[PDB]
Design a protein around this ligand. Structure first.
Ligand SMILES: CC(C)c1ccc2oc3nc(N)c(C(=O)O)cc3c(=O)c2c1
Ligand SMILES: [Cl-]
Length: 497
């Protein structure tokens, strides 16, 4: 697919303003939701602030804090100094007068990791008041509505060209496809309708869809579009051309398999960030393993396949249910007891162990064991560590592979902050990692392909009613990201050529 389609790009055209009146009422106009969380909203909000002299200081301070948050440690002292001199001095041209004396004085002191975070909250609080109100009453808000109208237009199977098959497995096939208008590459997972019904796979598919839709993280595969065809239910999501971790452990360098420790730590840190994102939203992954951790072109990883994931309702702290992969399921799960997010951290310990050791903690390399035998080992067998493990790796895996979930390291006080402070992540800049700034340790070769692999019922009302609910359409944030990434936003959002 060495070519976008101009026929479908032509369909991406901004509507007249009258077509956006209906949308203006039936839409969440929250400041946080519109101008911070939605890329096009933020972009248009900042353009508004740019073009209004009085909001210049607040805009540039906002940008410089974000600049400081992603900068190299060597440049941070300088950028902190320049920032304070530019915005936090009464006589400075871009002095932010809207701040309190308390916040300005505070920001002028200290040089910590979380510096300017109180300052950012103060700026965003200010911007969400008067400047936001002015924005709603400006052309830039109307332009946002135009983009939102375009976002809501139908973009089903006709907008996607499948050009290669990636996998064939449980419940359907996975294709690599191109969004025709913009040319962006996606992975499309197609679930066969008849097969789903036959396996009663409605809950598992619906739950996965809803989770992928509501979650937005660089360490979890994103859902961009959800639509239906005559035969399939389709999920268009982030493509990951590097393939799964497991392949990279064993099938590159087969004479010395396993990752170098720095590389294993990098992926672990990325996985942790993904897990935290789910756990902070009361979701349990329940299927963490090398084969479900995928690599993209740049060498960054994401967790995938949320089919066994479960969301706790409000008030609920633990759940019950046998689900997962043999060798990665925690003891408390295997015993049929209640469990929380701790099960995912046990799986992380196993995942990290396998990355370094090039084998499971409970089996030798290539050993085939029956599920009853492997169940006994997880519950009873103590994990041994070969010489490739450093003191940090061993200690960390020992902490994660605790059979008792009370003694096990993981989610505490609404975060993984306690886990981050382990000496294993000594050389990891969490701040840059989470912003996707860190250079990955290994970059996959685009030439190289990192993989192996190769009834009649009628539909009722409840089936079609379910499929429409499933086919929720375009996911707002991933779509906006796409419009910007591909330059379609820049191209259509002009004023004077
Ligand atoms: C055939 C192999 C080299 C390959 C290349 C790209 C891939 O891109 C993917 N993207 C996804 N979102 C998911 C997923 O959502 O599970 C899975 C894959 C692959 O398996 C996958 C496998
Ligand atoms: Cl205006």
């Amino acid at each position: 697919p060495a070519s976008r389609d101009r026929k479908y790009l032509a369909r991406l055209k901004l509507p007249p303003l009258s077509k956006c009146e209906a949308l203006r009422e039936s839409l969440d106009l929250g400041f946080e939701g519109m101008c911070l969380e939605q890329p096009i909203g933020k972009r248009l909000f900042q353009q508004f602030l740019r073009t209004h002299e009085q909001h210049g200081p607040a805009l540039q301070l906002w940008k410089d804090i974000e600049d400081y948050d992603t900068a190299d440690d060597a440049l941070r002292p300088q950028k902190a100094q320049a920032l304070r001199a530019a915005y936090l001095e009464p006589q400075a041209q871009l002095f932010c007068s809207f701040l309190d004396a308390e916040t300005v004085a505070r920001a002028r002191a200290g040089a910590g990791d979380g510096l300017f975070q109180p300052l950012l909250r103060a700026v965003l609080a200010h911007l969400g008041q008067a400047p936001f109100q002015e924005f709603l009453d400006s052309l830039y808000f109307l332009r946002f509505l135009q983009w939102k109208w375009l976002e809501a237009q139908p973009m089903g199977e006709d907008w996607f060209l499948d050009f290669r098959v990636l996998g064939r497995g449980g419940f359907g096939e996975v294709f690599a496809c191109q969004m025709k208008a913009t040319g962006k590459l996606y992975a499309c997972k197609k679930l066969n309708k008849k097969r789903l019904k036959k396996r009663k796979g409605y809950q598992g598919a619906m739950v996965e869809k809803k989770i992928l839709a509501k979650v937005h993280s660089r360490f979890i595969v994103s859902l961009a579009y959800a639509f239906e065809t005559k035969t399939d239910l389709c999920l268009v999501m982030t493509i990951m051309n590097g393939g799964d971790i497991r392949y990279h452990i064993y099938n590159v360098d087969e004479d010395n398999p396993g990752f170098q420790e720095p590389r294993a730590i990098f992926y672990t840190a990325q996985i942790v960030s993904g897990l935290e994102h789910l756990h902070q939203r009361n979701i349990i992954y329940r299927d963490l393993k090398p084969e479900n951790v995928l690599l993209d072109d740049d060498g960054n990883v994401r967790i995938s396949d949320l089919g066994l994931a479960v969301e706790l309702k409000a008030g609920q702290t633990k759940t019950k249910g046998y689900a997962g992969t043999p060798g990665f399921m925690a003891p408390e799960l295997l015993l049929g007891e209640e469990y929380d997010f701790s099960v995912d951290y046990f799986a992380l310990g196993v995942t990290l162990y396998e990355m370094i050791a090039a084998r499971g903690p409970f089996r030798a390399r290539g050993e085939k064991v029956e599920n009853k035998e492997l169940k006994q080992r997880v519950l009873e067998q103590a994990v041994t560590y070969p010489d490739k493990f450093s003191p940090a790796s061993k200690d960390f895996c020992e902490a994660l592979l605790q059979k008792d979930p009370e003694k096990r390291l993981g989610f505490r006080d609404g975060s993984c902050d306690g886990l981050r402070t382990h000496p294993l992540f000594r050389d990891i800049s969490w701040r840059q990692l989470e912003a996707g700034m860190l250079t990955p340790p290994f970059v996959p070769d685009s030439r190289t392909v990192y993989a192996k692999n190769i009834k009649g019922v009628a539909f009722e009302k409840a089936d079609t009613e379910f499929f429409q609910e499933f086919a929720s359409g375009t996911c707002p944030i991933p779509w906006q990201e796409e419009m910007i990434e591909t330059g379609v936003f820049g191209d259509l959002n002009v004023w004077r050529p």
